[PDB]
Design an enzyme around this catalytic site. Structure first.
Site, PDB file in Angstrom:
ATOM      1  N   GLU A 133      16.152  15.109  24.573  1.00 11.28           N
ATOM      2  CA  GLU A 133      15.540  15.248  25.879  1.00 11.28           C
ATOM      3  C   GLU A 133      14.299  14.342  26.029  1.00 11.28           C
ATOM      4  O   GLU A 133      14.114  13.717  27.067  1.00 11.28           O
ATOM      5  CB  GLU A 133      15.227  16.723  26.156  1.00 11.28           C
ATOM      6  CG  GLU A 133      14.725  16.999  27.540  1.00 11.28           C
ATOM      7  CD  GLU A 133      14.733  18.482  27.865  1.00 11.28           C
ATOM      8  OE1 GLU A 133      15.687  19.184  27.440  1.00 11.28           O
ATOM      9  OE2 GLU A 133      13.788  18.946  28.545  1.00 11.28           O
ATOM     10  N   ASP A 152      16.292  18.751  34.343  1.00  8.74           N
ATOM     11  CA  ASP A 152      15.211  18.437  33.414  1.00  8.74           C
ATOM     12  C   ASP A 152      14.356  17.319  33.964  1.00  8.74           C
ATOM     13  O   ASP A 152      13.156  17.307  33.752  1.00  8.74           O
ATOM     14  CB  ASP A 152      15.791  18.078  32.047  1.00  8.74           C
ATOM     15  CG  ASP A 152      16.583  19.233  31.457  1.00  8.74           C
ATOM     16  OD1 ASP A 152      16.036  20.346  31.520  1.00  8.74           O
ATOM     17  OD2 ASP A 152      17.745  19.056  30.992  1.00  8.74           O
ATOM     18  N   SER A 161      20.226  16.541  34.457  1.00  2.16           N
ATOM     19  CA  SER A 161      20.277  17.568  33.440  1.00  2.16           C
ATOM     20  C   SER A 161      20.525  16.861  32.107  1.00  2.16           C
ATOM     21  O   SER A 161      21.284  15.901  32.054  1.00  2.16           O
ATOM     22  CB  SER A 161      21.422  18.538  33.772  1.00  2.16           C
ATOM     23  OG  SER A 161      21.690  19.397  32.688  1.00  2.16           O
ATOM     24  N   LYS A 217      21.758  17.146  28.095  1.00  2.00           N
ATOM     25  CA  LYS A 217      22.513  18.035  27.210  1.00  2.00           C
ATOM     26  C   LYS A 217      22.958  17.327  25.942  1.00  2.00           C
ATOM     27  O   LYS A 217      23.126  16.109  25.926  1.00  2.00           O
ATOM     28  CB  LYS A 217      23.752  18.611  27.932  1.00  2.00           C
ATOM     29  CG  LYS A 217      23.448  19.545  29.083  1.00  2.00           C
ATOM     30  CD  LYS A 217      22.985  20.905  28.580  1.00  2.00           C
ATOM     31  CE  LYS A 217      22.150  21.615  29.636  1.00  2.00           C
ATOM     32  NZ  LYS A 217      22.757  21.433  30.977  1.00  2.00           N
TER      33      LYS A 217
END
Ligand code: CL
Ligand code: ZN
Length: 213
Positions: free
Chosen positions: A93, A114, A125, A127
């Site tokens: 991330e 995010d 997002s 992941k």
């Protein structure tokens, strides 16, 4: 979604023709490739006799191809697979964060997304999926469903307001998932990943995959 009627007629249409004339961005190719790689149709297509056709073979290998946009060394972005979220998800991330605009990072507990970049109206997002766990390697459709869940979440999002900051769907033009996977991900797992990506498109969600080795 392609019915057996449609698939049968599509195969018939391509008999004895040069397959390089196929536009792999055409809606029909896309639908057929999804139909033919969906494994709940494998025994169906095999025992039905459609698998002896080049276009059906070509659809399957196309959906099994490696579609990773980039390959990055784990050791260089402070990441490890299978050693817990702190060494897996979080460095992933942060790495995505370094590649997005400096204003884009959403608060920790913000729901679903995010990052969000107002310049392009793009909500992202982030992941990661360890495909090398005993479960994922030996259980069909888990990689697919995991990504599908993320996709539906991202498409479902309407509004979230958290401690003085809000994002509404009227201001989201692009929904994206930045997915990291290990580089020893298998051919059969790639089929699942591409089926998930194509499903993403129908829900207006762009799934971008980075291999991390
Ligand atoms: Cl919502
Ligand atoms: Zn987060």
């Amino acid at each position: 979604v392609m019915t057996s009627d449609e698939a049968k007629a599509y195969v018939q249409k391509w008999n004895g023709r040069d397959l390089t004339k196929i536009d792999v961005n055409s809606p029909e190719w896309t639908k057929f490739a999804v139909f033919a790689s969906d494994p709940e149709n494998q025994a169906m297509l095999v025992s039905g006799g459609l698998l002896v056709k080049d276009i059906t073979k070509a659809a399957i290998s196309f959906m099994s191809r490696n579609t990773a946009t980039a390959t990055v060394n784990a050791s260089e972005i402070g990441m490890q697979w299978g050693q817990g979220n702190m060494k897996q998800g979080m460095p992933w991330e942060d790495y995505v964060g370094k590649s997005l605009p400096a204003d884009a990072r959403l608060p920790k507990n913000f729901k679903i997304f995010d990052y969000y970049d107002g310049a392009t109206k793009t909500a992202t997002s982030v992941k990661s999926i360890d495909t090398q766990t005993m479960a994922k390697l030996a259980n069909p459709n888990q990689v697919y469903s995991s990504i599908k869940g993320n996709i539906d979440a991202a498409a479902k999002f309407k509004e979230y307001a958290l401690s003085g900051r809000e994002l509404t769907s009227s201001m989201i033009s692009n929904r994206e998932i930045q997915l990291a996977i290990p580089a020893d991900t298998t051919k059969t797992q790639w089929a699942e990943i591409n089926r998930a990506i194509e499903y993403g498109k129908s829900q207006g969600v762009k799934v971008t995959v980075t291999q991390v080795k």
